[PDB]
Amino acid sequence: FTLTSPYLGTCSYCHHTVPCFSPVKIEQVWDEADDNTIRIQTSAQFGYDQSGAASANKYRYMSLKQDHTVKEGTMDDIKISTSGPCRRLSYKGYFLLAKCPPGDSVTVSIVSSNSATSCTLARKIKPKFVGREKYDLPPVHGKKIPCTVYDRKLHLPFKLIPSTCMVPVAHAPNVIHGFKHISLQLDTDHLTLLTTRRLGANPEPTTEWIVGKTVRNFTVDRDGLEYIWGNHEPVRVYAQGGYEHATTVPNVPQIPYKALVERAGYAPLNLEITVMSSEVLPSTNQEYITCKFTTVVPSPKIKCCGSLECQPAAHAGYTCKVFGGVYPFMWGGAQCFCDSENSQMSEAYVELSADCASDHAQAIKVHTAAMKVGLRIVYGNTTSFLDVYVNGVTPGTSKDLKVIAGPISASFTPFDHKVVIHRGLVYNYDFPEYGAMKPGAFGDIQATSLTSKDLIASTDIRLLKPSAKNVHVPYTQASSGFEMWKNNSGRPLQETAPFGCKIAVNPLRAVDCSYGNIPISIDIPNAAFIRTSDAPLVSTVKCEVSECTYSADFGGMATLQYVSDREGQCPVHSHSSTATLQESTVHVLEKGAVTVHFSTASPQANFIVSLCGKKTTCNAEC
Amino acid sequence: FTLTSPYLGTCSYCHHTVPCFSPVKIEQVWDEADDNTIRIQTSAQFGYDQSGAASANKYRYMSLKQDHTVKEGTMDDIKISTSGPCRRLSYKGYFLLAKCPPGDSVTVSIVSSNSATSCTLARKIKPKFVGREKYDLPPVHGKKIPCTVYDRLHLPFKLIPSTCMVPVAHAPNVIHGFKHISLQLDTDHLTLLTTRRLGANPEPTTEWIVGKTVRNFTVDRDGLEYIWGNHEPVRVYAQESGGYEHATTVPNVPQIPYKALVERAGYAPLNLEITVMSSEVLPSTNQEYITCKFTTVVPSPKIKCCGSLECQPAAHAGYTCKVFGGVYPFMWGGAQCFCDSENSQMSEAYVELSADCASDHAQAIKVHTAAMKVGLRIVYGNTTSFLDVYVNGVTPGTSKDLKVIAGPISASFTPFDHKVVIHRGLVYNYDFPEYGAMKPGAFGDIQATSLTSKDLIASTDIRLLKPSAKNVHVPYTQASSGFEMWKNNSGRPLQETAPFGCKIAVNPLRAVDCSYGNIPISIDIPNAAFIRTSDAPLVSTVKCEVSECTYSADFGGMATLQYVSDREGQCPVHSHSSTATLQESTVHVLEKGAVTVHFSTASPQANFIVSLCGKKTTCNAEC
Amino acid sequence: DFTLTSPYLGTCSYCHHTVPCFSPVKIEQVWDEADDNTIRIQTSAQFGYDQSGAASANKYRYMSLKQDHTVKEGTMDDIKISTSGPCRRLSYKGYFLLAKCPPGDSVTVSIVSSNSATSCTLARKIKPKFVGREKYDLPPVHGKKIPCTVYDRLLHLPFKLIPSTCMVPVAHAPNVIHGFKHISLQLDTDHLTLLTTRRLGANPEPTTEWIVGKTVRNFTVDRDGLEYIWGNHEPVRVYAQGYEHATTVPNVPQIPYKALVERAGYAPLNLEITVMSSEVLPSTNQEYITCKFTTVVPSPKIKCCGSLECQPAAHAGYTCKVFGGVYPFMWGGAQCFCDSENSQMSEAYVELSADCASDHAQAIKVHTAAMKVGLRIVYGNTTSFLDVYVNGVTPGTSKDLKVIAGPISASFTPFDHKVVIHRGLVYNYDFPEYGAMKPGAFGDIQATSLTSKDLIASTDIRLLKPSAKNVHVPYTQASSGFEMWKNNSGRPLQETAPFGCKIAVNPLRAVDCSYGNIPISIDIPNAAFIRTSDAPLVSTVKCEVSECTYSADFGGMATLQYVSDREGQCPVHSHSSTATLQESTVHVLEKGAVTVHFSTASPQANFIVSLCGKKTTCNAEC
Ligand SMILES: *[C@@H]1O[C@H](CO)[C@@H](O[C@@H]2O[C@H](CO)[C@@H](O[C@@H]3O[C@H](CO)[C@@H](O)[C@H](O[C@H]4O[C@H](CO)[C@@H](O)[C@H](O)[C@@H]4O)[C@@H]3O)[C@H](O)[C@H]2NC(C)=O)[C@H](O)[C@H]1NC(C)=O
Ligand SMILES: *[C@@H]1O[C@H](CO)[C@@H](O[C@@H]2O[C@H](CO)[C@@H](O[C@@H]3O[C@H](CO)[C@@H](O)[C@H](O[C@H]4O[C@H](CO)[C@@H](O)[C@H](O)[C@@H]4O)[C@@H]3O)[C@H](O)[C@H]2NC(C)=O)[C@H](O)[C@H]1NC(C)=O
Ligand SMILES: *[C@@H]1O[C@H](CO)[C@@H](O[C@@H]2O[C@H](CO)[C@@H](O[C@@H]3O[C@H](CO)[C@@H](O)[C@H](O[C@H]4O[C@H](CO)[C@@H](O)[C@H](O)[C@@H]4O)[C@@H]3O)[C@H](O)[C@H]2NC(C)=O)[C@H](O)[C@H]1NC(C)=O
């Protein structure tokens, strides 16, 4: 049941372009959803009849006159419109919520029994589509995406919850790989965004929106390159104690490093290290929050026949101005007796939007990091895995294996000293220092958090001398530095990052970057080394290559003839980077024939392959 | 009467943005007319009451519930809308047909007694205007033009060709000058202005104009054609602003007569004027295929509860399948199956021709070198005859009394390329792909030797998608309609770009009235029309005087010939130098000794040898 | 009152079905001329009356669906207008409607009574109209009042076009930043605002642009300053920080000229002249009027079975054409008897628009002027003020002071030989001579005045052969040279004028220009001169400067020590333009200390200051 009733309010357009004094007065409106939905705040009550009752399909309002006659109608005859039809969804007493089309103004009206009152407001709605694909209607088809939308004194509206919206998915580009080449034959019914970046050091990121039919070649710098195409998923294409051991493993996810542990008298050791995962975790000093502010304008304090010298009332984005000789004796809006001895004090400030919480950003300094690594090492018959911070000190407390990953070979970061985080998205942005705010620009208003912890704003509010027909406090103001930065935020770092880094946000991090080499010291338990205790003596090895392909995954095929005393298990490895073997161990029999697969990227290569203790040389054309 | 009833169908937007399961479900829509009209295919029946009867103003539909209650209403309360009003025209049982405005989506709804159901579809309509003049409404005024439009298996409103009213633009105030044409233009709306030179190199030039501008164009001496907004195509030039076998060479240029003198020993010179009345350049046409807007058919997916479904190449149209595993769960979630990760759906779909492929298609066509006929009109003495003749050193124009053979043209030239497309009446030089070598979304995406679907082979980059498990719905992307795409990007027709002022024509593919090079011609004139020195008046002592003259006019020349003749007769007057030509070829010689003749030139101080009967002289003047 | 005429039926081209019909509510004309976004519609149906011509505030009447002359009636309740959206009427005037409509592609008037729906629609194009220099889609509740014209709401029977006041919005005051010969203009507008500028010097290099959202806009400041209008704000400008006597005063409003009258034996005289106001009044020969013409098309005179050789009927913009073989028999063409022996004469002409009077322009030659001046001269204890024409002759008949202002130093005018005046606005425009009209260009139609004093038009009307299904006379025509010039009139002279002139219009004039110097001869009444009759000798003056600021209003501060015999009153003045004194007289005491304020625009200046008879030199750094 209700404790308050529908009121009447001054409107500027009422079925006749002339300003009136009707119910259904529009006070505010919210256009913040990713969804194409709207929240309207009117002066009329819905859901109630004559009293504050429970009529699912009834509203009530003030009278055409002013007799305090709160007559009622059926929620059936209340319709919204902007520049076309509008279909409501929910009624919340004083509030409406609908999906409307263009967005030049908003008109709420009653079309009951011939009597037609309608207030309309001069607010501008814009076409909203969330995806990287332009749509005018959520597809029956397509993907589910993170978005926010409206549900279906203070807190009484339809709150802004995050949820899922259906974006369409674009018509997979017919791709054509070539010599360091990718033409991308594209054919979209609609406007799709096409992003790219190299996975090398210099990514030369490249965004564009495409429509209809074109082709789009891109170089492939040998390091490959990622391309997102219209809220598809981001495919990327390429160009086709114990013994302490010190190596240097290149920092590149998923690519195993084969090496040979050489110890006197002992038999060479199976060693493959795979940097399963890298993270670059930098230290984050959150500076402030920021969002769409709201401007509050309290009824002006007017003093009939005196001076009103306004006083600095320290808070939010406060501003006053003292205006003299305001209203003349008779009406002009008020009941003041003197003419040129009047004064009004215009005061107004800013707060956070009712929805600041659901859509804000995070000013954040970022100083140099640390980097963990998911190392997976295999030695002989056992494979183990430890995480390790990359500095000359902290050992990866793997129980059976003590590893320390030396200082990375080149300090590199995707981030700048200063960073903004919007949603899951981080941008390198030189946001102003807390308290050094410029208006209409990003960070126009600031706050250490959402709980309005000392919010300091600068929104260039400008109070205007009010004319004398009504008590209305006028003012201009700057634009919303947030919204303005939003419509002009770049393509995220997750899409521009200089090394194929996969920027992640809660911990700010650069997942799976690829650059430089990592020194690594491994303490292998003596308990897994075999000392010349392979009964087979091995002698007279030679190398023959059966087949070969140039620059493939594993197109190499070579065989090794020899003579061994008995049976055992040899570790095979190449002592020249011009080639690498697919396997690191081989079951040597007495037959004297060992087939091994390898990979290269040359026409006529020369590499020294090594069985157990012996070494040879191989050759072939690819 | 009807044998089938209104059904219910899943929609994606129903008065509340939420997808529903309502009647009035929109299944397809057609946006192909040149007219601004639309064909809609709904789930509800119109024209019938409770049963399949004859209610001119009644429809029926399924219920709000599902009781198979087929309740009825009045065709009065069914309204269409897209982004504004829409006015229907006809009801065809399941079908609607209206004219609608913008074209972002389509919404069919019932606004009866407070209960409001409405399905709406995410289709995009575009502003259609047929003419070369932009209009938003057919004028009360203006021209009638060829267009296609909807009438008012096969049950819809068919697509017939007919006539549409385009507006005609405000005649440009033209100003001729020295090799010059400024075109002062002033249009209320968007009009297309085309041009091309009539010479060898036409440098064609299209532009759409609005409001007020000027547009000069050179005039290369060969003149030039300009169409201006579905006006008719005026063009402007640069003047001020057996028997005896005779061998000449007539320039190939329509309507311009060739005066010559037959000189035979002892015989009296002969009246000879040849007018190439008409030329045609008829090249051999190998139609390759048809092409048009395809339609994609998606048959209900065959799902096998708890097994593998390895799909098989079912050879036809543009067929494609894909086998999707671990599709749906148990009971409700996905089609009444019982296993979870032991499921499989086969997504299959193909393409056909549009219901309207026939009314709007194109014709892939190779064009190898031609033959050219000519409408020759020859006059000799008192008789004028006319024969058609192929232009090769052989085939004689079987005119009964006159045997003509037109030698091989002086320069093989064609307006066409080895490969050509013909859309409506319009031909474009376009390198369409070979039959069976189709690229998708590009022209010729789908092919067919004819409209009777004679082995249609398509490539439309269809891509099947793994269906999610809340409904049995087979998803897929696809390429764009290579036809429509080529349509929105067909150039300006050849009829408007042709390099010699050719008037490209289509049913026989032909280049009417081109103008280039000279035509050798051998004429066998019947001896029976030659006069041998049998003009009694002896003619002697001719001289030439020019009274007036204008330079480069139609016939501004005026000269007189004094002489002395024995008696009366009829002389043939002709000029033995191309620097000038006479308007008349015969003259009634009297004894007076004074003959006035009109001539035309294009020089200041010309020198030409005029010839009466047998005598010859020289004339002079400044123009 | 009551009516004497009834609703008729007319051929329409679109009637609820795209097919042309023969319905009531036939739209005959429409008016789209207001600055307001309002429309005047002329239909075939009568409003305000029932069955007879009575007084039904809410009733209309019309012809029948059939043709029985049955003039049935409805309620003015069910008649609605639309163009491409809703339309709300305002007034009913018998045959006329008047509404505010949105886009403007066509116009549709219809009746939606009891299921029977007739609607005629017309192919006219309405355009978005906003009057201000600020783009708006709705008059603000806020903002300024501006001159505009609009249709009333209370031959001659329509809703007339009266000039009045329209509310334009006022833009968000630019945050301005002054610098070294510099003005950056930080701008932030919700909407499209016009930003004009011009230098106040000789060469103004005027610069218009429309801005939106947020930018910055620097402008040089040429030492002469410069005016900037910003979006129907007011146009701020910023700068760079008896005895006959013959002087030459610089022509510059409000800046006083201090001088010393030196006469033998007499004591120097207080002389300050302020050119309070200047006017440049040139001679105006109005040539013609011009405006939106209207084309009249009288029913064609057709002669059944004969030739109709049309005759030059001398008037307005007359044109005829004789068309032969028009209509076959009856319903072969227009009811007649012969087929190819028919002839129609198509005639049509132009008039002035019903509203030509409220919105026209004025072709006007302008030959060289005269210039008056508001001179305010002060001599000793008395200050007087005379106006004076600036030529070597006419004396300013001030009673006690005879002044003659010599011929100005440089003949300069803001205007060209030929000028157009639209509203209050004058543009330099080479309009064609009377009778030398080109069509669609400005001055397409002409008239010595509004009373249609011999109006001569050239509107390229082109008659077309009418097709034979109806008697309808077709024709093309050129565009409205007026309207065309309107949409393409430049920025007014009031905004481009080369010397900071304030162009004014009724008398055509150039208010308060600033250029060159004015010679002036003054006849000062001997009766105000003091001859060495001040009791003090003055001797030994020196100059000391206390403080100084460079290029300020009056930042200079100097003191003068000396020795005087007695008390008196000295005239202080600077004998070098490098500096000027704020005061011209000083009360000399015996103390020997005189403090004076001065102004300069230099770092280390050198000027010769002069007391009574003595002279010195001053110095300081600023
Ligand atoms: C983007 O890169 C793509 C992928 O390479 C590229 O596609 C290919 O371009 C080449 C350039 O012609 C084409 O190769 C041709 O094969 C066709 C027949 O299909 C021919 O017409 C060509 O012959 C010419 O080119 C030869 C090599 O220069 C010459 O030696 C010869 O004399 C001819 O001039 C040629 O062999 C290939 O067809 C395309 N593939 C397609 C259809 O995309 C594409 O060109 C690049 N696109 C852009 C916009 O950069
Ligand atoms: C294209 O279309 C037309 C066709 O020519 C053309 O119209 C006229 O062209 C000429 C040249 O542009 C213009 O003639 C001029 O008229 C003025 C003013 O009345 C003259 O006195 C001009 O100057 C003469 O003397 C001057 C100094 O000696 C020289 O400037 C000049 O060489 C002359 O000797 C001059 O003769 C005429 O203005 C237009 N008239 C129109 C527009 O109807 C038009 O200008 C061409 N425009 C384009 C877009 O090419
Ligand atoms: C329009 O003109 C305005 C007014 O000149 C101009 O204003 C800009 O103001 C900003 C903010 O002050 C200037 O940005 C910098 O501000 C700092 C400290 O606040 C300066 O001292 C900067 O220069 C430093 O760095 C430069 C490289 O080391 C050196 O040039 C300098 O010696 C300093 O080390 C700098 O001024 C900005 O420079 C001015 N702009 C100037 C002066 O041109 C505004 O930029 C102008 N806008 C446009 C669009 O032209």
XYZ file of C-alpha atoms in Angstrom, chain B residues 271-502:
232
model
C 22.842 10.523 -109.911
C 24.213 8.486 -107.007
C 23.338 9.016 -103.354
C 23.728 6.286 -100.734
C 22.331 6.619 -97.232
C 23.300 4.079 -94.605
C 19.838 4.337 -93.097
C 20.692 1.918 -90.297
C 23.548 -0.245 -89.035
C 23.547 -3.223 -86.688
C 26.409 -5.097 -85.112
C 25.101 -8.554 -84.303
C 27.590 -10.717 -82.400
C 27.197 -14.419 -81.639
C 25.877 -15.104 -78.164
C 26.555 -18.235 -76.096
C 24.315 -17.912 -73.052
C 26.235 -19.592 -70.244
C 23.934 -19.549 -67.233
C 21.152 -17.796 -65.404
C 21.592 -16.314 -61.951
C 19.441 -14.690 -59.292
C 18.588 -14.313 -55.611
C 18.805 -17.836 -54.223
C 16.716 -19.135 -51.348
C 18.165 -21.288 -48.573
C 16.173 -24.351 -47.521
C 16.688 -25.749 -44.040
C 14.950 -29.099 -43.490
C 14.219 -30.116 -39.890
C 17.406 -31.654 -38.476
C 17.593 -35.419 -38.212
C 18.591 -36.171 -34.621
C 19.424 -39.658 -33.369
C 18.852 -40.257 -29.669
C 22.001 -41.958 -28.345
C 24.073 -42.658 -31.453
C 26.456 -41.394 -34.134
C 25.109 -39.832 -37.343
C 27.809 -39.718 -40.001
C 26.260 -37.535 -42.709
C 26.578 -38.490 -46.374
C 27.175 -36.323 -49.495
C 23.605 -35.876 -50.760
C 24.419 -34.443 -54.199
C 22.178 -31.476 -55.012
C 21.887 -27.622 -55.332
C 24.203 -25.952 -52.813
C 24.134 -28.790 -50.277
C 25.958 -28.727 -46.962
C 25.772 -30.840 -43.816
C 27.648 -31.052 -40.556
C 27.559 -33.681 -37.845
C 27.331 -32.224 -34.338
C 27.995 -34.390 -31.299
C 26.892 -34.214 -27.686
C 23.960 -32.071 -28.700
C 21.052 -32.314 -26.266
C 20.629 -33.756 -22.696
C 17.638 -35.751 -21.324
C 13.824 -35.405 -21.349
C 13.055 -31.733 -21.947
C 16.450 -30.168 -22.585
C 16.668 -30.971 -26.286
C 14.159 -33.264 -27.974
C 13.063 -36.067 -25.642
C 16.343 -38.007 -25.658
C 17.824 -40.030 -22.768
C 21.598 -39.876 -23.171
C 23.672 -36.766 -22.420
C 27.040 -36.880 -24.188
C 26.006 -39.641 -26.573
C 23.856 -37.440 -28.812
C 24.232 -36.246 -32.392
C 22.435 -33.871 -34.751
C 22.970 -33.562 -38.499
C 22.575 -30.014 -39.748
C 21.788 -29.931 -43.453
C 20.731 -27.099 -45.752
C 20.806 -26.073 -49.403
C 19.831 -23.338 -51.855
C 17.164 -23.030 -54.541
C 15.977 -20.255 -56.806
C 13.833 -17.511 -55.364
C 10.090 -17.739 -55.882
C 10.770 -14.751 -58.063
C 14.041 -15.784 -59.700
C 12.107 -15.771 -62.947
C 10.958 -12.128 -62.812
C 14.402 -10.735 -61.828
C 17.556 -12.518 -62.961
C 20.562 -11.949 -65.187
C 22.234 -13.725 -68.056
C 25.880 -14.726 -68.143
C 26.850 -14.518 -71.787
C 30.004 -14.923 -73.822
C 30.155 -12.836 -76.972
C 32.349 -13.742 -79.921
C 32.851 -11.560 -83.000
C 29.863 -10.600 -85.078
C 28.410 -9.803 -88.434
C 26.918 -6.439 -89.324
C 23.876 -5.754 -91.445
C 23.200 -2.342 -92.970
C 20.083 -0.543 -94.162
C 21.376 0.917 -97.404
C 19.221 3.325 -99.414
C 20.623 4.000 -102.873
C 19.276 6.421 -105.476
C 20.278 6.338 -109.125
C 18.718 8.760 -111.583
C 14.909 8.705 -111.473
C 14.734 5.656 -109.171
C 15.532 5.038 -105.497
C 15.923 1.558 -104.039
C 16.755 0.033 -100.661
C 18.490 -3.190 -99.631
C 19.896 -4.668 -96.409
C 23.375 -6.074 -96.694
C 25.735 -8.013 -94.475
C 29.167 -6.404 -94.452
C 31.579 -8.999 -95.816
C 33.222 -9.283 -99.210
C 30.594 -11.825 -100.254
C 26.870 -11.900 -99.454
C 24.990 -9.718 -101.968
C 21.927 -7.778 -100.820
C 19.230 -9.662 -102.739
C 17.496 -6.499 -103.799
C 15.684 -7.560 -106.956
C 16.755 -4.790 -109.336
C 20.037 -3.862 -107.641
C 22.899 -6.209 -106.770
C 24.968 -4.722 -103.959
C 27.819 -6.264 -102.000
C 29.263 -4.354 -99.047
C 32.961 -5.127 -98.657
C 34.554 -5.942 -95.283
C 34.265 -2.997 -92.887
C 37.436 -0.882 -92.561
C 38.023 -1.560 -88.846
C 36.681 -4.404 -86.743
C 35.151 -2.714 -83.708
C 32.799 -3.879 -80.975
C 31.205 -2.279 -77.898
C 31.292 -5.629 -76.115
C 33.796 -7.806 -74.232
C 34.266 -11.534 -74.588
C 32.029 -11.782 -71.502
C 28.812 -9.824 -70.888
C 25.950 -9.752 -68.404
C 22.415 -8.823 -69.327
C 20.178 -7.792 -66.470
C 16.895 -6.317 -67.589
C 17.200 -4.621 -70.922
C 20.627 -3.692 -69.788
C 23.944 -5.167 -70.734
C 27.177 -4.676 -68.845
C 30.670 -5.795 -69.726
C 31.404 -8.078 -66.771
C 33.892 -10.921 -66.382
C 31.432 -13.347 -64.749
C 33.053 -16.614 -63.649
C 32.910 -19.734 -65.848
C 30.036 -22.123 -65.239
C 30.991 -24.197 -62.226
C 33.795 -21.898 -61.166
C 31.661 -20.014 -58.693
C 32.826 -17.698 -55.925
C 30.215 -16.969 -53.211
C 28.689 -13.556 -52.540
C 30.223 -12.465 -55.842
C 28.180 -12.411 -59.080
C 27.270 -15.846 -60.345
C 27.305 -17.280 -56.834
C 24.591 -19.643 -58.075
C 24.197 -20.793 -61.665
C 21.717 -22.589 -63.932
C 21.525 -23.226 -67.665
C 17.953 -22.039 -67.340
C 15.037 -21.073 -65.121
C 13.659 -24.587 -65.212
C 16.418 -25.367 -62.694
C 18.496 -27.225 -65.280
C 21.248 -28.526 -63.018
C 21.775 -25.539 -60.722
C 25.189 -25.413 -59.093
C 25.710 -22.993 -56.191
C 28.481 -21.930 -53.802
C 27.101 -19.779 -50.988
C 29.598 -20.336 -48.138
C 26.967 -21.771 -45.817
C 28.292 -22.440 -42.344
C 26.428 -24.723 -39.935
C 26.632 -23.986 -36.229
C 26.403 -26.236 -33.174
C 22.839 -25.721 -31.875
C 22.389 -24.898 -28.182
C 20.084 -27.050 -26.102
C 16.822 -25.303 -25.312
C 15.118 -25.853 -28.668
C 15.550 -27.779 -31.919
C 16.742 -24.904 -34.058
C 19.410 -25.326 -36.715
C 21.703 -22.274 -36.856
C 23.882 -21.184 -39.740
C 25.617 -18.225 -41.282
C 25.967 -17.764 -45.019
C 27.468 -15.495 -47.648
C 25.601 -12.567 -49.196
C 23.587 -12.769 -52.427
C 26.194 -12.407 -55.166
C 23.336 -11.263 -57.356
C 21.862 -8.533 -55.194
C 25.425 -7.550 -54.389
C 26.289 -7.189 -58.030
C 22.998 -5.395 -58.610
C 23.740 -2.657 -56.023
C 27.068 -2.397 -57.802
C 26.356 -2.946 -61.469
C 27.863 -0.046 -63.327
C 26.182 2.305 -65.689
C 24.965 0.085 -68.613
C 26.790 -0.200 -71.923
C 23.830 1.542 -73.537
C 25.241 4.540 -71.673
C 29.007 4.000 -72.058
C 29.289 2.629 -75.625
C 32.400 4.048 -77.398
C 30.836 5.174 -80.691
C 27.385 6.477 -79.963
C 26.129 2.925 -80.349
